[PDB]
Design a protein around this ligand. Structure first.
Ligand SMILES: CCCCCCO[C@@H]1O[C@H](CO)[C@H](O)[C@H](O)[C@H]1O[C@@H]1O[C@@H](C)[C@@H](O)[C@@H](O)[C@@H]1O
Ligand SMILES: CCCCCCO[C@@H]1O[C@H](CO)[C@H](O)[C@H](O)[C@H]1O[C@@H]1O[C@@H](C)[C@@H](O)[C@@H](O)[C@@H]1O
Ligand SMILES: O=c1ccn([C@@H]2O[C@H](COP(=O)(O)OP(=O)(O)O)[C@@H](O)[C@H]2O)c(=O)[nH]1
Ligand SMILES: O=c1ccn([C@@H]2O[C@H](COP(=O)(O)OP(=O)(O)O)[C@@H](O)[C@H]2O)c(=O)[nH]1
Ligand SMILES: [Mn+2]
Ligand SMILES: [Mn+2]
Lengths: 277, 277
């Protein structure tokens, strides 16, 4: 049950005025594509706070990648779901190397010790019971990253993927999908909506568990058949999201590499960005 | 659980090409606004058929308005959810005046006898148990109407309203919301997203029952306080949708009066239109 929004004073949306004329802001299956200028964050914050929404964030920091945690977590505290309940789940082989990061109120961090290709999907799909009990949404991201600007409840939806920053302007035949028919991740040259990057996806706990289970099972089939998809779990993620359309798509604001790609006009904000490695 | 879509061959959506540059296609709370050119109906048909979706359509034909049923139902058969399961619920004081209309396969009609202002919301919110058992979505429309073009699963969502054709270009201070603070339907001049018309709303059975219950209760409060809202159940519908944002909004393609308003450039299709009275 959703209680009523309070009175709010904000600019009227005008039907004959779009703000964004330069980009596609809805998919052909009527999923919003999230760009700056498409959402009033005050309305969304109200909606999600009224539901006492809890967001889980999973991040893997294995071997040398524990070095990325301090900046990742400190910038998450500045930019990720501020004002909402957040539970970070840090998966690592070195619990003692997790930096001591000071968290805002309503935010928690759990260190989960693990003993590459298949680990993340397998692990997320097994934390199944814990996540269902503790959070409403799960967000699954790479650690070799920093938050530079707002990443908030505008992303939340049953299932989302993020447009890969190298391919948002590309034709589908150029997408680096797995192209060998012997792989479960196979996508022919005449199929595909978008190329989603494996570094940022999420959704409701149920839908994320469905996605990660499916990708894990498909990767195991490939392993049994002696084939490894060209971009590993990302290839499988792409196959899944082709066959199970996401209910929102994040624009490349949400996954950017400024060193590699600069700051194009179409990006009004660079929110979550690659750290050089 | 949602099974996988089959392979489909269709045009690639391109992020740097929107089709509709002339209109707002997403609300500030990230609800799609449904216009022609925003959806691939083949993808949506697949998604909803895979769930064996059943759509209920409620329509009231009381006193002289039974005369509108033949054209309403015959054109619904040509245009409304064709290929999907449909259950029409015709509420009337004259069951014998309901015309014999031939239905396509998978489609059913029930005549519900009833013995104005408050009837529709009260009645819909009591058919509660029946609707929950028989249909997945409910669509609630005026009878003094005809279908001229496709109205399909692109509308389906937990909660939708439709932009009133006289007000989609108006500023909110011009909206004919109830403006007296003594009414439960009251909306001040600095609030409001859109003016929704009472002739076409819907959603999941649960959300429609919530809306109609709330509007019925608010109308009863007004009655007890000796006030009737300026546009009756439409005023209440507008108050509800201000405080409970719809998850899709239908463009005026879905509720048009060609005699009154012609055929503006912004409307590529006239789907569901007023019959002169
Ligand atoms: C000099 C490296 C050139 C990389 C350009 C293309 O990107 C790669 O695209 C692949 C798919 O075809 C995979 O998604 C890689 O993860 C991605 O490289 C990753 O994401 C990119 C955004 C960069 O941050 C890159 O350093 C990183 O390894
Ligand atoms: C000559 C009549 C002028 C009516 C113009 C404005 O519309 C009315 O708007 C009101 C709200 O302010 C209510 O929604 C009425 O139902 C609507 O009139 C209804 O819907 C309209 C689209 C027309 O079909 C009208 O005949 C019908 O009574
Ligand atoms: O030695 C490693 C390699 C990978 N990863 C995790 O797997 C993610 C994906 O790897 P990487 O960032 O190297 O991939 P790329 O950005 O090149 O796709 C990383 O962000 C880490 O979360 C890790 O923890 N340790
Ligand atoms: O005598 C009446 C008056 C109204 N209605 C029902 O209530 C709806 C709303 O009334 P109307 O269409 O007259 O309103 P308007 O289009 O002027 O808003 C009609 O379409 C009918 O479904 C009816 O059945 N009999
Ligand atoms: Mn990375
Ligand atoms: Mn009418």
């Amino acid at each position: 049950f959703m209680v009523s929004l309070p009175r709010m004073v904000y600019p009227q949306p005008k039907v004959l005025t779009p703000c964004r004329k330069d980009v596609l802001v809805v998919t052909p299956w009527l999923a919003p594509i999230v760009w700056e200028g498409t959402f009033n964050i005050d309305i969304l914050n109200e909606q999600f706070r009224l539901q006492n929404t809890t967001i889980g964030l999973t991040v893997f920091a294995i071997k040398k990648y524990v070095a990325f945690l301090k900046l990742f977590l400190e910038t998450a505290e500045k930019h990720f779901m501020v004002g909402h309940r957040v539970h970070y789940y840090v998966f690592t082989d070195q619990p003692a190397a997790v930096p001591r990061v000071t968290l805002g109120t309503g935010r928690q961090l759990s260190v989960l010790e693990v003993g590459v290709s298949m680990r993340r999907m397998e692990m997320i799909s097994f934390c199944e019971r814990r996540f269902l009990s503790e959070v409403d949404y799960l967000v699954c991201v790479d650690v070799d990253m920093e938050f530079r600007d707002h990443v908030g409840v505008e992303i939340l939806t049953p299932l989302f993927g993020t447009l890969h920053p190298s391919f948002y302007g590309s034709s589908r035949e150029a997408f680096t999908y797995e192209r060998r028919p012997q792989s479960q991740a196979y996508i022919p040259k005449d199929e595909g909506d978008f190329y989603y990057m494996g570094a940022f996806f999420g959704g409701s706990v149920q839908e994320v568990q469905r996605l990660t289970r499916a990708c894990h099972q498909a990767m195991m089939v490939d392993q049994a058949n002696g084939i490894e998809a060209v971009w590993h779990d990302e290839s499988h993620l792409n196959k899944y999201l082709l066959r199970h359309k996401p209910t929102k798509v994040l624009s490349p604001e949400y996954l950017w590499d400024q060193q590699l790609l600069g700051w194009p006009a179409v990006l009004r904000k660079l929110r979550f960005t690659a750290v050089p490695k």
